[PDB]
Amino acid sequence: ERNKTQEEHLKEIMKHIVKIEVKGEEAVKKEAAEKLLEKVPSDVLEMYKAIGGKIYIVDGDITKHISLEALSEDKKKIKDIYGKDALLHEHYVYAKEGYEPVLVIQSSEDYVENTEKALNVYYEIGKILSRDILSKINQPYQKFLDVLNTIKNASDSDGQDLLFTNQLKEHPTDFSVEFLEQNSNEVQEVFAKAFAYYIEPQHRDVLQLYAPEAFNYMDKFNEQEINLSLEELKDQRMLSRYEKWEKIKQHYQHWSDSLSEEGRGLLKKLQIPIEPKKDDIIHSLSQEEKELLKRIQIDSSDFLSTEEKEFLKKLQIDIRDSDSSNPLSEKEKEFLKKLKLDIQPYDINQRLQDTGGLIDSPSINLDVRKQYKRDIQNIDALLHQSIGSTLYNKIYLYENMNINNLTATLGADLVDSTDNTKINRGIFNEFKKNFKYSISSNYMIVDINERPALDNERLKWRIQLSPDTRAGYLENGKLILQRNIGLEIKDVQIIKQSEKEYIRIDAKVVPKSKIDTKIQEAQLNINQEWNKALGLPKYTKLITFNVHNRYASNIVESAYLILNEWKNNIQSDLIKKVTNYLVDGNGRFVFTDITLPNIAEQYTHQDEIYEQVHSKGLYVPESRSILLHGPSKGVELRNDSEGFIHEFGHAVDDYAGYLLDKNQSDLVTNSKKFIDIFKEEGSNLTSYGRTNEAEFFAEAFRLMHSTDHAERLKVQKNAPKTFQFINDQIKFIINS
Amino acid sequence: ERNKTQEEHLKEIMKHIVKIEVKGEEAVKKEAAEKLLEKVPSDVLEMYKAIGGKIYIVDGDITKHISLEALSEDKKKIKDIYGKDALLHEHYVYAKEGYEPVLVIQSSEDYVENTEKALNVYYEIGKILSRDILSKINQPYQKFLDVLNTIKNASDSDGQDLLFTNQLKEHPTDFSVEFLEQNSNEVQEVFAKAFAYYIEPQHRDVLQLYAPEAFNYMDKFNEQEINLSLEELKDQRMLSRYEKWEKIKQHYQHWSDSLSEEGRGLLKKLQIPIEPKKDDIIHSLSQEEKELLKRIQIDSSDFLSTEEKEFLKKLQIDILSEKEKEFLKKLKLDIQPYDINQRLQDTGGLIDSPSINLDVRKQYKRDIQNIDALLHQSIGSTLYNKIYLYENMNINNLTATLGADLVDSTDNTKINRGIFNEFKKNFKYSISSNYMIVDINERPALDNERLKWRIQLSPDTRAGYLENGKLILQRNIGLEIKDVQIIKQSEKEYIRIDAKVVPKSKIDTKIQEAQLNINQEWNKALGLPKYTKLITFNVHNRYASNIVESAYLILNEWKNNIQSDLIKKVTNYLVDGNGRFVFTDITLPNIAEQYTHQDEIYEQVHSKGLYVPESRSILLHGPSKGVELRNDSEGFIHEFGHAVDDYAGYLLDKNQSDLVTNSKKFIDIFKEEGSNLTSYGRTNEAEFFAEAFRLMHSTDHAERLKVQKNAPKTFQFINDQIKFI
Ligand SMILES: [Zn+2]
Ligand SMILES: [Zn+2]
Incomplete structure (x- = not known):
């Protein structure tokens, strides 16, 4: 498996694609070329074979080979790795483009010593790779471009001088993919040069010394990533x-x-998921539910999606065939929630x-x-x-x-x-x-x-x-x-x-276990960091990572970012007091990528199963916890941080209410004072904020603590009573 | 010329994929196979070559060949073309499926005489075609399925007996794409079978005799369509x-x-089109122009589109039904x-x-x-x-x-x-x-x-x-x-x-000849002068021929649903003013019967239909979908209603006004029933009148009845307008 049939593999390539056509007794001229092409990654050679390429080893004037007998006069005029002019007629290496490509190398042993001839042979092979092979799979592309721009913008112009032509060195801006389309030959050559310098033992250090990024790119490309190129070539x-x-x-x-x-x-x-059958749903309904259904304003709920609403409106018909007044009735809301679970x-x-x-x-x-x-x-x-x-x-x-x-x-x-x-x-x-x-x-x-x-x-x-x-x-x-x-x-x-x-x-x-332990380690690490920053007792368990899906590591890493913004935009004492209140009730900040109805901090406190909520965020009073769903997109939000701060708004609401006295089981927004304020400025902020006092308060809080100070001013010039009401609570909490 | 690149070509294929491995009579054996493979369309052999296939002519037990050396015992059991079993070690042909397909044929000189064995070889090649070649480009598919269904549902069950197995005959319904997906072997089999009967010369008549549809399909396929199969294969x-x-x-x-x-x-x-820049548009308003834009009900007019509403609404955050909605017409041209x-x-x-x-x-x-x-x-x-x-x-x-x-x-x-x-x-x-x-x-x-x-x-x-x-x-x-x-x-x-x-000229000539043909038909049916030009095909786009042919269908429904004399009277009036019935596929603002009579460029209208009084012409844009109307027939009849509204008004003062709908003696009628029909008719009296007219002559009598019990006045009023004769 290892170098076992690996060395047997490379020998299979040379077999088919390398034709030793010389007259000076083929024996030492062959071994020489073998030692030459041996420094080239085996996959490059396998891709060439796949492209129909052939490597011809012959002595004399290479321009007189059967394969090169058709070259245009302009093609016989060429340049070397250094840009010096020369004629094919008297050169030793040439890579013929065309879709019946060939690499003609002039037999010789000078390659062992003459590192300048070798360097050039690898340069030509680099052209093969960049121009004849990778082009078949749309490469090089953005990745290589970033490398070119890193050099083009580097401080020490030594890298530019070692690989860039004058045209590239003079481009006024970064190289875009557009540039790559109209100047493919230029990008192709910079690639070949770097490849050449990397493959040639002696020049590799020269590359890593003056073109670090080019060296890193070629090192990782040849040692690893090139097997992927081969795989992608085969996939075509x-x-x-x-x-x-x-x-x-x-x-x-x-x-x-x-x-x-x-x-x-x-x-x-x-x-193929099973859709719910109209009839099965109907027969499962009680006479009271059928009546409630056939008279309910479906297109007025916010708990139902379009598909669901359409499905219900169809059932509503089957039953029928046998400013005020807009919100759902007392039990119509409960009925729809319960119906929602049955129609999935x-x-x-x-x-x-x-x-x-x-x-x-x-x-x-x-x-x-x-x-x-x-x-x-x-x-x-x-x-x-x-x-x-x-x-x-x-x-x-x-x-x-x-x-x-x-x-x-x-x-x-x-x-x-x-x-x-x-x-x-x-x-x-x-x-x-x-x-x-x-x-x-x-x-x-x-x-x-x-x-x-x-x-x-x-x-x-x-x-x-x-x-x-x-x-x-x-x-x-x-x-x-x-x-x-x-x-x-x-x-x-x-x-x-x-x-x-x-x-x-x-x-x-x-193994999934390997990833779960990484999550576990991060959970412990993020808690140690915040227990310290928030002055919470050592060993306090505040943050929980409930991570199980395809964007796992981002859910974990963004939590650090989310809490950083949270602490940066809000007053320390407000953050400490509210958080300490949550901790006193064994609450948690929960970051997850599974739906909220499946988080215990929510479901262990539900009366009925259907009384579940799934959204970007959620604050559960009973468990004093903030739940933040990663993959979803919140309404009126552009960040998860904004979503979290929004929910912290609810917690602040809760704690302020709680401080009022030993009972109230509500929110400071439930106060007659705020209600009146809501009736007045209720619709001066976000539409989502117009839902209710709770949501308006949370939204106001969120905007007042936005990274964008402009957003904060808006609340003062559009909802003056609210701006003052919120700051009154914050002080109330801080001074307590 | 023709065979100059054909004979030499086919021989190049035979050279690469045909290996003769026989005793020593390598001359007669090789020539026999060549004669055999000859009957096969060259493109099949080229396609086989393309998928790496090889053909071997051998002596004795074919299963003793290297290519079929690894063959599993189970696969050595085969069923001939007629469904009878046979043992490969006793058979003369076999097509090995797989990423390295192979065809093995036992050499014989009487294949021309022993038609049943030749039929079997062609059947195996037909199998390579459907199972190994065509499957790589997702074929056979719907086209072939239609042939199958036309066979199982043909008067005589001859074809079925000849080409279908029991699995196919017993099918209760027609063969659907679903059936083909879970019976690929069966479909591929029938295909191979049809292919075989068509290729074997002596068997071609039988196929044509009992399975006509199958013969026609294979005839058109092996004579030209297969060339496209090769092209699609190469495109992979x-x-x-x-x-x-x-x-x-x-x-x-x-x-x-x-x-x-x-x-x-x-x-x-x-x-890549260049979208309009906000900074550019805004700077063109400045004074009062900005003021007007400042406070306008954007999401109100029906002259703008969704993409156009957003852009405009965005112009507001960067700074009506009167002469200000006129400001939107002008602006609409500037934001494209x-x-x-x-x-x-x-x-x-x-x-x-x-x-x-x-x-x-x-x-x-x-x-x-x-x-x-x-x-x-x-x-x-x-x-x-x-x-x-x-x-x-x-x-x-x-x-x-x-x-x-x-x-x-x-x-x-x-x-x-x-x-x-x-x-x-x-x-x-x-x-x-x-x-x-x-x-x-x-x-x-x-x-x-x-x-x-x-x-x-x-x-x-x-x-x-x-x-x-x-x-x-x-x-x-x-x-x-x-x-x-x-x-x-x-x-x-x-x-x-x-x-x-x-050449485009060749298509324009077809359209021109059709325009004369349709005018000749309706000039006669309408009693108009022999060479009057009423109908015009302003056709310039990709669905050209449909614009032309549906014109006939649209006018037929127009006649069959409206009183012959109402039609004659109104059209004679349109012709009197040199009007036209314009069927087109370019937008209405570019026709002429409309733009030559616009006072301002921004007053242009584009939609499914339009009636221009000044030119007495009805314009019908084929490509679009009426925001209300269901089809083109209805779209036309709707516009005709506008024509009637124009003539009726003309017959009340041939020297003033023009529309009976514009009469104050009709507006009131619109105040009651105006909101009792389609929402499109609810727009105004003209549209209401046009809409009511359309419904009354609908192909769906139900539709006709509604206007009766939903708009009793209008139904009696309109029937009184048609009275003017
Ligand atoms: Zn909220
Ligand atoms: Zn109209």
Whole structure:
């Protein structure tokens, strides 16, 4: 496996692509070339072979070779690695472009000593890689460009002088992808030079010495990432995609034939959720509920989505076929909540994702909960065959994904807007910033060979499977993977496919346990930091990470950022007193990526199951806890920090009310004073703030403590009574 | 000439994929196989070669060949064409499936005589075609399925007996895409079978005799359509795609190297329109103009669009139904994106059209004239023969009315067959008035693009090359539609449109001949002078032929639903003023029957229909979907109502006024029932009158009845207006 058939592998390449055509007794001229091309990564050679390339070793005038006999007069006029002019007629190395490419090297042993001839041979091979190979997969692209711009803007211009031509050195601005399209040859050459300097033993130090970023790029590219280029090149071939599909299918052939009718049915419903049937819902209703339904104003609730409203309005019809007055009635609201739970589609995977694998979570009705549990355990037993095989060295599988599943907040500004084919770099950098690990609580459905995405899928995952990863095969060339998978993010970059930009995410499957311990360590670390900063007792448990999904590491890292803003925009004493009040009731700041109805701080204090809430944030008085959902996008918010501060507004509301006396079980916003203030300025801030006194107060609080001081002024010039009311409470708390 | 590159070509294939491994009579054996493989369309052999397939002619037990050495015992059990079992070690042919497909044939000299064995070999090759080749491009699919269904539902069950197994005959319903997905072996089998009976000369008559549809399908497939199969197969290959791209790149190399900065700039903005800048618009108001904008009910007028409301509403945060809504009409012209291709599509190529301000009109003309000169080099080259280019298109660009129901309401990966057949019915020719931007090699479509064009260029077609593998073709392109079918790609269904480029003059001639033909028909049916010009086809865009053919259908429904004498009277009046029934695919503000009579440019109106009193003409824009009306027939009848409103008024004072609806003696009637019908009619008396008129002559009698019990006065009033005769 290692250098075992690895050395057997490289010898297979030289076999087919290297033709030793000389007259000076081929024996020493061959070994020489072998030692020459040996410094080149084996994958570069395998990609060349895949591109139909051929390496010809011949003596004499190379321009007289069968392959080069057709070159245009202008092509015989060339330049060397240093930019010096020369003629092919009297040169020793040439890489012929065209889609029947060839690399002609003039036989010689000077390569061992003459490091200037070697350097040039590698420069030409670098041209092959950059111009003839990587172009077939839209590379180099943004990643390499960043390297060029890092040099072009570096302080010590030594890197610029070592690799940039005068044209590049003189470009007035950073090199954009536009520049790359119209000056491909220039980018291609800078690449080849760097590659050459890295491959040639003696010059490598020269590269790392004057072009650090170029050295880092080439070091990581040749030692690691180049295997991915080969994989991606193979993924573009009709016959290689088909061969790979056939071998995976054959590997799961016994498993596929052993599937029962029940097994097959389980995989199908997993892939295709079951919509609720109109009739089944109706017969489950009581006469009183049927009457309540057929007369309820559906399009007036805020607890129902469009699909749901449409579904209900249809049921409303089936029943029928057999300024004031706008809000739902007393029990119409309760009825709709209860109805909401019954109309959700039966979706195995969605159940796992919402619960993060906690399938016993009492967020749904016991009967449905039990059926989900049954299918899950049955699917797990079904997926027992690991991917490991004697047919593939490394296995990569693909997944097109909607960025909104990870962060709907960044998803809103990811696509340019002026040109849909492009991604905004600022949002991209923010997305990538703290993305180191990911978790799949549900069963990932993946493609054997990469396929085209839908408009809303701008994420393209390339996943390296573990040989121990268990999975099942699907006839449409897909695999269903076992639940509870850990993923290490190796690289995140902007790429181009079919003339459209996407975010490539390279990930490696690892044991989920490895990722859970990282989460656990962070939870302990963030508490030690804040217990100290807030002056809370040592060992105090305030912050909880309930993390189980695909953007895991970001949920964790953003919490530090969220609390930093919180402390920066709010008065220390207000933060201490309110927080100490929460801690006195064993409360928690909960950061999670599973839906809120599945967080104990909420569900253990609910009377009925349907009395559940899922949103960006939530403050639960009974448990004195703040819950913040990461992946969702809050209304009128542009940050999770704003969402958190909004909820802290509610806690401040609670504590101020509490300080009023030994009873009240309400909010300071429930005061006759604030109510009147609300009736007056209630609609001068955000629309969401007009919902009720509680929400108006929270919104006012949020805006008054915005990182943007302008937003804070707005509250004073639009809601003067409120601006003063809030500051009155803060002082009331601080002075207490 | 023809066989100059055919015979020598086929021999190159035989050379690569045909290995003769026999005793020593390697001359007669080899020649026999050649005669055998001869009957097969050359393209199948080339496609087999493309997927790595090999053909071996051997002696004795075929299973003893190296290629079938690893064959599992189970696969050694085969069923011949007739469904009878057989043992490979006793058989003469076998096609091994797999990433390294192989075909093994036992050498014989009596294949011409022993037709049943020849039939079996062709059957195995037919299996390679459906199972190993076509499956790589998602075929067979809907087109073939129709053939199957036409066979199982034909009067005589002859065809079934000849080509269907029991699994197929026992099917209770028609074969759906779902059945084909879970019975691929069965479908692939019937295909191979049909293929075989067609290829074996002696068996061709039997096929044609008991299974006509199958014969026709295979006849048209092996004689021409297969060429497209090869083309699509090649379009899957990385190296084939890049080789085609490179030849085209080479052909345009001098053109590309000679491009200036200005030239490149034009090609750029042609691809990406320039949205209006706020700072630019605001600075053009300043004084009272800003004041007016300051406090206006934006989301009120129906003259603006959603995208246009936001921009305007945004102009307010950066600083009505009277003469101020007039201010919005003017502003609407100033906020459009600078989009060259849209301007050409809206005007149908008439760039002098006075539909936008002079400053912008001139800017567009200069850019267009400059682009026309840049694209001077035609694709014709010595580096390649027939070139196909590709284009993904939003169906709403052709017909937004069908486009609303094209995609299955539940499963968006599926196409509604009913709308498909409607869309395809009269789609025979198309015209491009703007610059088509096509892909050298086919690429994936966006969500709202379900049409996939495969266009055969003409060596004379002029184009510009782009670095991203696309070509910008010259404007004024003519296209003949060769085939339209439903296909599957990447788990989604699409509409494949095979079109061939021809001189635009050739298409304009078809439209011109149709205009004379339709006027001859209605001049006779309406009793008008022999050569009057009533109906005009102002056709310039991609759904050209449908605009023309639906005109006949629209007028037939117009006649069949309205009193012959009301029609005759009103039209004679329109002709008296030299009016027209204008069926078009360019926007209304660019017709003439409208713009020559506008007092101001901003007073222009674009919509599904329009009636202009001054020119006595009815204008009907095909491509769009009526914001109210359900179809074009209704759209027309609605406008006719306006014509009636015009004539009736004329018959009350042939020297003053014009509309009976404008009479104060009707306004009141509008005060009562005006809100008792469609919300469109609720707009005003003219629209109400037009709407009421439409309903009364509807094809749905129910509709007719409603106006009776919902608008008893109007129903009696209108019937009194038609009285004027
Ligand atoms: Zn709130
Ligand atoms: Zn009208």
